[PDB]
Design a protein around this ligand. Structure first.
Ligand code: HEM
Lengths: 55, 419, 446, 54, 22, 106, 49, 33
């Protein structure tokens, strides 16, 4: 490969678990809670750090 | 103490036995399937069959088979030739029974499963590759397919193109037609004949006539030449020998030895070998050569084998011929025939001086003749050869359709018209 | 009917006998056609000094090319026309020449052999003809990884000792070697008691004994002044010798832990141990189902091409280990399984497993003895090795005392916390660092 | 589903005065939860497997 | 097998560890 | 002594079979199996026909699941047609392994 | 050719106990492992403190 | 591969009953004459 951004950096390859990964077709709405799970972890954190900026 | 004991049954399968003194007993069921029993469409099947001995069968799973013999320290060898297929089975006195029941499953109850047979396949390549490392095997093989047309011209190793194509009904068919009662001969080196028979009677009664493969013989002169990059070149020059267990044959054998150069001394050179002397004188420093002699049921192959370097190929090749022509011109003194003879006789005896040797010798005889000829008798026959007789045979190579096979850089290897 | 044990006890005992000079006579009778008479001299490579390192091996090329009685090709012609074969083998501890021959041929057999040992017509021409040959054999032995590697092993586990030298010897010692030097060699080491005249088959001991041409004897001391061990211990060293040649297609690795002399109770128990690990090749028919893990793993995972465990037995030294040939990328995995098999063995042996190996042993040790040649070599070598006993029926007994705890405790002496002898002829790029192979011999984890 | 609704039932108790009414209920819900998880489901599994002839 | 005797010295180590260390 | 009882299980069985929805999906019982190490080997042992079949079936099935659509009433798997085609293969695989385990006792 | 190989003189790097070209290392090296393992057990014992 | 340079060559095939006999055994494996 040449200038395939993704696998060029080794780091950026590690991020291709989001984009290129095998994901089953059929899949209830239930699985979105994984992702949202992370969403919440990131929101609490940003929020926490600002509150702990005045607590 | 007790000598062997043959017994032909109603089926026509032979069985022998010798309760020996020593600790180790060895059975070996010799079925009459050689490579010669396959057709254009069936080539390579014995090969795979030979390699598929430890697969699941009706009463014992590949795992039990292997682990079982291991349990007791047993060995299971499955040997074949162009004419026959010896299925050997060694183990300790006490464990024959556990072992025998193994030999019987492997041979009468094979279950070639699509999946199992399939994983083997690749083994064929690995096996072919390791035996094609000795020039002798590819040349010696090339020889048989040049010299024959149809049956014995089939090689022992599966043809490259066939490998993965060996199908389970093929294996099943081959066993069914060839692994039968009339073609079988049990042989024990430390078992009771009385108990052997019983078992034989209980497990070896299957029907199947000969030649459902397409039996028949035929000789055709021909040359197979394989170019290489190797310094050394090997070639074989051979004419229709006499057939198996016949006088002519026997004569050949004696003749073979008058020229026959299988060193009897480490680091030692033959003084006796005519071929070697004659070749030697007209030949360079490094080289080696020897008398080839093959005998089968319906045909033979006699002649020599050479190993020369690039430029010396012809010189050696002709040299060897010329010398064997000498014997055919009549030039052969009594003193050399008797030496020969004794050489032969000594060899055959040492051949049978071991369990493994004896067991082969015996089974071998049971598929040809139908009984065991004792050594002595054997010895007598070889002696009956006339000094002339030998010459006469020899006369036949020089005046018998040529058939050669060589390998390496063939700039300097005579063709048929060259010699 | 007859049962293993029985057979065992029924076997023809070996008769050991002595001439006035110490010529040892042994023989096992069977009243059979062919006979293999042999003279098993025990002055090997390990007596050679740096110069005559390849001395003995040189004599072996001359052994069969003339006696003052039997000149140029008189030996061969004689053997041949009988139909007898004549072989000479040489070891780092044992030289031996034997004849295979019709039993009626003893008369001129034993004469020949005897002749051979003593009178060897060796002219300058034969010396300069052999040199060239030797130098050419050497070149050809460099073409064999297995032979190249096993030499290495010895040299590194014997670094700094007479024993570490090739039996083939130094290249240039062949060139240099003085014609006078083969004499002193022979003269000093072919003197029995060393020698043994052994034989098996259809002969009567009585006649062997008598037949022995009582021509020259041991020109040595009657007292302890001789007792200065010519068999002086050879210092044990755990080092590795790594000779990397990425040019070569495969990789040979011989890994060893020093072991017992020829005679020792621990020395049969070891065997039973290696029975278990076993030995394996690309062409074994059992592969994945074979009961020894290294084999199964190997078979299964295409781990290696071929592997064999060995027990090399010398009077004061012993090489123990296995040897595996494996692609460049699999050197470490096979190291891991192997060493792994060792440790598991000295801590977790199970009676089942040791009982299977046991039985393997018996067979290996009975089946070898099939044939005349075999028996003869066991009888000859057995006498300089283990002294004048023929432990054949004992074996089963000794082998019988084997217990899973016996096997475990004996294996732990030699392998556990011991420092390995490792050599390879690369692709050794992936060959484990000496410290890694070291820590492989103790169990924290892995 | 029942476990889930048992879990809801338990959550309810949580905001309840610790008195008879709630006590007695919670106690049977806490046994139900562990039954559902430890004993009922596992058996049901088997059954279903046996009805399918598995 | 050797596991009892080894599990028993591993046993002992933990114990003496706790005892002492704690 | 099962004449009335065991000739009525088929009644719950039948009930149950169509209860579990996989019936509707066009799938069969063997294709609903938990793919573990034994199933896996059985699976591998299947002929091209049997085996490609199990791939289309599951393809058609996961397609339906993705779209939350049931197959038409006319095209459904009928209990009377219980191809237990994996069963044969699956049994042995187990059979082999049980043996292997057992042989390893002592 | 691969026989004119010699392993180099290690005499400077080895030690008292196993320097004896002609004698056994088995009845020497029992201790040698002790002394090295001793060092380990001590370190690990002080560090533990 | 083993170098075949010298006088040592002594390979040619010819036995009594067996000729070119190829073994395949569960443990060992080979090619004889
Ligand atoms: C998922 C992980 C976290 C969870 C579940 C969580 C949850 C909570 C909850 C329930 C409270 C009590 C707020 C109230 O009811 O008044 C709280 C307060 C607080 N958290 Fe978080 N939090 C998380 C991560 C963080 C992080 C990462 C930070 C800092 C970077 C943080 C900083 C604070 C601060 C400073 C307060 C105190 C002031 C307040 O009551 O808002 N938290 N957190």
């Amino acid at each position: 490969m040449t200038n395939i951004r993704k696998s060029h950096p080794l780091m950026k390859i590690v991020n291709n678990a989001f984009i290129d990964l095998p994901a089953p077709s059929n899949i209830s709405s239930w699985w979105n809670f994984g992702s949202l799970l992370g969403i919440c972890l990131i929101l609490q954190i940003l929020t926490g750090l600002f509150l702990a900026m005045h607590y | 103490p007790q000598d062997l004991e043959f017994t032909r049954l109603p089926n026509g399968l032979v069985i022998a036995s010798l309760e020996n003194y020593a600790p180790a007993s060895r059975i070996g069921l010799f079925i009459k399937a050689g490579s010669r029993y396959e057709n254009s469409n069936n080539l390579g099947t014995s090969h795979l069959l030979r390699l598929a001995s430890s697969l699941t069968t009706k009463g014992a799973s590949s795992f039990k088979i292997t682990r079982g013999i291991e349990a007791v320290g047993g060995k299971l060898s499955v040997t074949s030739t162009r004419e026959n297929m010896a299925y050997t089975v060694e183990c300790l006195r006490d464990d024959v029974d556990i072992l025998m029941e193994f030999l019987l499953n492997v041979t009468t109850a094979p279950e070639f499963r699509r999946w199992e047979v399939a994983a083997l396949q690749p083994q064929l390549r690995i096996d072919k590759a390791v035996a094609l490392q000795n020039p002798q095997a590819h040349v010696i093989e090339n020889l048989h397919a040049a010299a024959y047309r149809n049956a014995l011209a089939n090689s022992l190793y599966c043809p490259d193109y066939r490998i993965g194509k060996v199908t389970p009904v093929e294996l099943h068919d081959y066993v069914q037609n060839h692994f039968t009662s009339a073609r079988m001969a049990l042989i024990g080196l430390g078992v009771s004949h009385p108990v052997l028979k019983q078992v034989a009677e209980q497990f070896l009664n299957i029907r199947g006539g000969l030649g459902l493969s397409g039996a028949k013989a035929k000789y055709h002169g021909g040359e197979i030449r394989e170019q290489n990059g190797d310094s050394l070149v090997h070639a074989a020059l051979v004419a229709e020998s006499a057939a198996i267990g016949s006088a002519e044959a026997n004569a050949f054998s004696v003749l073979q030895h008058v020229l026959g150069a299988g060193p009897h001394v480490k680091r030692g050179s033959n003084a006796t070998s005519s071929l070697y002397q004659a070749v030697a004188k007209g030949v360079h420093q490094p080289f080696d050569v020897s008398a080839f002699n093959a005998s089968y049921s319906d045909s033979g192959l006699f002649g020599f084998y050479t190993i020369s370097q690039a430029a010396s190929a012809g010189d050696v090749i002709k040299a060897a011929y010329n010398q064997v022509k000498t014997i055919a011109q009549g030039n052969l003194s009594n003193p050399d025939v008797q030496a020969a003879k004794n050489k032969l006789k000594a060899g055959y005896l040492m051949s049978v001086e071991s369990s493994e040797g004896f067991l082969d010798e015996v089974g071998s005889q049971a598929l040809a003749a139908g009984s065991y000829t004792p050594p002595s008798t054997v010895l007598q026959q070889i002696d009956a050869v006339a000094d002339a007789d030998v010459i006469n045979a020899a006369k036949k190579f020089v005046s018998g359709r040529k058939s050669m096979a060589a390998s390496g850089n063939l700039g300097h290897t005579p063709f048929i018209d060259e010699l | 009917t007859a049962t293993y044990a029985q057979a065992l006890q029924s076997v023809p005992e070996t008769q050991v006998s002595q001439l006035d000079n110490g010529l040892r006579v042994a023989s096992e009778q069977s009243s059979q056609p062919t006979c293999t008479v042999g003279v098993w001299i025990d002055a090997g490579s390990r007596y050679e000094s740096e110069k005559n390192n390849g001395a003995g091996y040189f004599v072996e090329h001359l052994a069969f090319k003339g006696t003052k009685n039997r000149p140029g090709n008189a030996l061969e012609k004689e053997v041949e026309s009988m139909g007898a074969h004549l072989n000479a083998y040489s070891t780092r501890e044992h030289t031996a020449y034997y004849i295979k021959a019709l039993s009626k041929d003893l008369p001129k057999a034993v004469e020949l052999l005897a002749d051979i040992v003593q009178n060897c017509s060796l002219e300058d021409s034969q010396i300069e003809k052999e040199r060239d040959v030797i130098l050419q054999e050497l070149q050809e032995n460099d073409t064999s990884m297995r032979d190249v590697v096993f030499n290495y092993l010895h040299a590194t586990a014997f670094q700094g000792t007479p024993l570490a030298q090739s039996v083939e010897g130094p290249s240039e010692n062949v060139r240099k070697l003085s014609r006078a030097d083969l004499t002193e060699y022979l003269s000093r080491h072919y003197k029995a008691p060393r020698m043994v005249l052994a034989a098996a088959g259809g002969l009567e001991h009585r006649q062997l004994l008598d037949l022995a041409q009582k021509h020259f004897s041991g020109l040595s001391g009657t007292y302890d002044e001789d007792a200065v061990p010519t068999l002086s211990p050879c210092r044990f060293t755990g080092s590795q010798i790594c000779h990397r040649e990425d040019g070569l297609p495969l990789a040979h690795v011989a890994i060893a832990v020093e072991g017992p002399g020829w005679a020792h109770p621990d020395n049969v128990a070891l065997q039973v141990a290696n029975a278990i690990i076993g030995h394996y090749d690309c062409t074994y028919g059992g592969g994945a189902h074979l009961s020894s893990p290294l084999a199964s793993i190997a078979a299964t995972n295409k781990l290696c091409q071929s592997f064999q465990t060995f027990n090399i037995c010398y009077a004061d030294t012993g090489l123990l280990g296995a040897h595996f040939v494996c692609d460049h990328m699999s050197i470490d995995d096979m190291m891991f399984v192997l060493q792994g098999q060792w440790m598991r063995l000295c801590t977790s042996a199970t009676e089942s497993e040791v009982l299977r190996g046991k039985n393997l042993l018996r067979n290996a040790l009975v089946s070898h003895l099939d044939g005349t040649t075999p028996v003869c070599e066991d009888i000859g070598r057995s006498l300089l090795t283990y002294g004048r006993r023929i432990p054949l029926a004992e074996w089963e007994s000794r082998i019988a005392e084997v217990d899973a705890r016996v096997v475990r405790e004996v294996c732990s002496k030699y392998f556990y916390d011991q420092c390995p002898a490792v050599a390879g002829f690369g692709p050794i790029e992936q060959l484990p660092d000496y410290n890694r192979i070291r820590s492989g011999m103790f169990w924290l984890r892995f | 589903w029942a476990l889930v609704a048992d879990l809801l039932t338990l959550t309810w108790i949580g905001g309840q005065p610790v008195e008879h009414p709630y006590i007695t209920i919670g106690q049977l819900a806490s046994v139900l939860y562990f039954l559902l998880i430890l004993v009922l489901m596992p058996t049901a599994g088997t059954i279903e497997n046996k009805l399918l002839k598995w | 097998r050797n596991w009892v005797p080894t599990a028993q010295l591993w046993g002992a180590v933990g114990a003496v560890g706790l005892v002492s260390a704690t | 002594a099962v004449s009335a009882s065991s000739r009525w299980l088929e009644g719950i069985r039948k009930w149950y079979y169509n209860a579990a929805g996989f019936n509707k999906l066009g799938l069969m019982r063997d294709d609903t199996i938990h793919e573990n190490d034994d199933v896996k080997e059985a699976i591998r042992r299947l002929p091209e026909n049997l085996y490609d079949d199990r791939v289309f079936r599951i393809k058609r099935a996961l397609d339906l699941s993705m779209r939350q659509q049931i197959l038409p009433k006319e095209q459904w798997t009928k209990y009377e047609e219980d191809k237990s085609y994996l069963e044969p293969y699956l049994k042995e695989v187990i059979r082999e392994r049980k043996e292997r385990e057992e042989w390893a006792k002592k | 050719s691969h026989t004119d190989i010699k392993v180099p003189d290690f005499s400077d790097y080895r030690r008292p106990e196993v320097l004896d070209s002609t004698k056994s290392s088995k009845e020497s090296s029992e201790a040698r492992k002790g002394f090295s393992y001793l060092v380990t057990a001590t370190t690990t014992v002080g560090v533990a403190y | 591969k083993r170098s075949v340079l010298c006088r040592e060559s002594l390979r040619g095939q010819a036995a009594g009953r067996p000729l070119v006999a190829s073994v395949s055994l569960n443990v060992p494996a080979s090619v004889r004459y």
